[PDB]
Design a protein around this nucleic acid. Structure first.
Length: 45
DNA sequence: CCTGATTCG
DNA sequence: CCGAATCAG
């Protein structure tokens, strides 16, 4: 499991949609909510 | 419909 | 860069 352009694309949409980090981690899968907050922070979303 | 931000290794 | 471990409201 890695951060593909698609998986980052999915992450972009949902974080902007206002979903909690745990819900986001749930849909993506194979990634803890910690890692989600980590990636968002780096992209400055 | 179970916090996010920021540091740390 | 990554995600766990802290920091912070």
């Amino acid at each position: 499991m890695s951060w593909t352009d698609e998986r980052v694309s999915t992450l972009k949409k949902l974080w902007l949609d206002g979903l909690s980090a745990s819900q986001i981690a749930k849909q993506l899968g194979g990634v803890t909510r910690n890692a989600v907050i980590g990636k968002v922070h780096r992209l400055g979303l």
